[PDB]
Amino acid sequence: NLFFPFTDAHKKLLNQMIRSNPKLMSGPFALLVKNQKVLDFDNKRYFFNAKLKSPKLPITVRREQVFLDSYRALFFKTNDEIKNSKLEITFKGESGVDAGGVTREWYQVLSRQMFNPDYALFLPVPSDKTTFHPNRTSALNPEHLSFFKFIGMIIGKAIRDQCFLDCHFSREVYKNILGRPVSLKDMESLDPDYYKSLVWILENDITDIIEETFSVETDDYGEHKVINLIEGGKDIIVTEANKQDYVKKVVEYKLQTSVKEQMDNFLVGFYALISKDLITIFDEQELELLISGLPDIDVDDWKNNTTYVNYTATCKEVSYFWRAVRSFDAEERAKLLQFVTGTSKVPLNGFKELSGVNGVCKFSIHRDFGSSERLPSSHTCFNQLNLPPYESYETLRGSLLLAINEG
């Protein structure tokens, strides 16, 4: 509870001094990666763009089909020709409308065209249908492996060109870009029913109630193919000792292994323009704010479309929460969104239509009841925040920021 008011003020002073004299860092760039858990996102964004500076490429595309045209126009350009060139985008017809602004909207329309179901590239995420995760059955488009490599190439090029993309993904996508491992809490936003299942397995005695094998059956492409999680998992019965390993092995396959090659291609196109050992300055929450951008959220429209369960409006904890939210900066407010709703994207119609797994799930603030010595938790499917009853406002603020940044 104590040291909470200090460690936040300490972090703000360190970053402020680095803004004043960025030469104070100097040295190897890898040291910034090693001590990222204290660096400001804007300072990270600064030193990132710094090391990123160490010709002209004419492209003409039809606005109706900017995805395939850009794909075919850059299909034979090498990585060096794409990493080191100024894209001069032209539209067949509608020519001479504007200058370099065409490139900014060239990225925007290209961002929406990626998720066209006609390509079978991405499937919508259940927590927020406006966010997408890769389609495990992307083999319907037989050239999909060249598409994910093309997509990661565009995402990385937009990062180099300081252009924001209206594309937001599930959290494990950014974690794969950074090489970070997935968690069971990632399964929440992608399949809350399976999450509730796996959580029950880890919480209850499964001696005779449930039984499984270390294998997964996928009725995919008219075949009952059974894949072994571990060697011989088709026959390894799940017990109580291997219970923790089963959930971990299951989550790994259901998330990363089931889309291993599409992600590998995606990373090949991405790492070809943004090296892994300098994109890893950012965590999975900051990486979304790099590509899409920091949102400008309306705390008023947020609190006006906020419900409270086992709490009340004008409560002591609720007063602490909003006095803390309004005391957060753009980075911490964005990560508070990402903590609860799972994304950094505010709905176009406002928080009054904040979507969830079942539909319009407005922002809920539940109550933890158990031990004020826990950090706040969240469920991205229902946009609810479990907030324990904290006595002091500063204990709430530090415990929020401790869950907001970390994870």
Question: Is the torsion defined by CA of 379, 382, 383, 388 positive or negative?
Answer: negative
Active-site option among 163, 167, 361, 381: 381
Question: CA–CA separation, 339 vs 110, rounded Å?
Answer: 28
The CATH number of the domain holding residue 208 is 3.30.2160.10
Residue 39 domain boundaries? 4-51
* Resolution of the coordinates, Å: 3.3
Q: What are phi and psi of 99, to 5 degrees?
A: -90, -130
98 with 160, same domain: the answer is yes
Question: CA–CA separation, 264 vs 260, rounded Å?
Answer: 6
Question: CA–CA separation, 359 vs 361, rounded Å?
Answer: 6
CA distances 380 to 57, 102, 183, 187, 386, Å, are 42, 35, 14, 10, 11
Q: By what method was this entry solved? A: X-ray
Question: CA–CA separation, 150 vs 120, rounded Å?
Answer: 15
215 with 344, same domain: the answer is no
The CATH number of the domain holding residue 93 is 3.90.1750.10
Question: CA–CA separation, 4 vs 394, rounded Å?
Answer: 7
37 with 64, same domain: the answer is no
328 with 389, same domain: the answer is yes
Are 145 and 374 in contact by the 8 Å Cβ rule? The answer is no
Q: Count the domains in the chain.
A: 4
**Number of DSSP helices (H) and strands (E) in the chain, helices first:** 18, 10
98 with 82, same domain: the answer is yes
* Residue 345 DSSP one-character state: -
| Residue 226: CB atoms within 10 Å | 12
Closest C-alpha to 4, from 303, 279, 385, 373: 373
322 with 399, same domain: the answer is yes
102 with 216, same domain: the answer is no
Would you call 381 a catalytic residue per the annotation? yes
Question: CA–CA separation, 132 vs 201, rounded Å?
Answer: 28
For 282, the token pair is 């950012």
81 with 171, same domain: the answer is yes
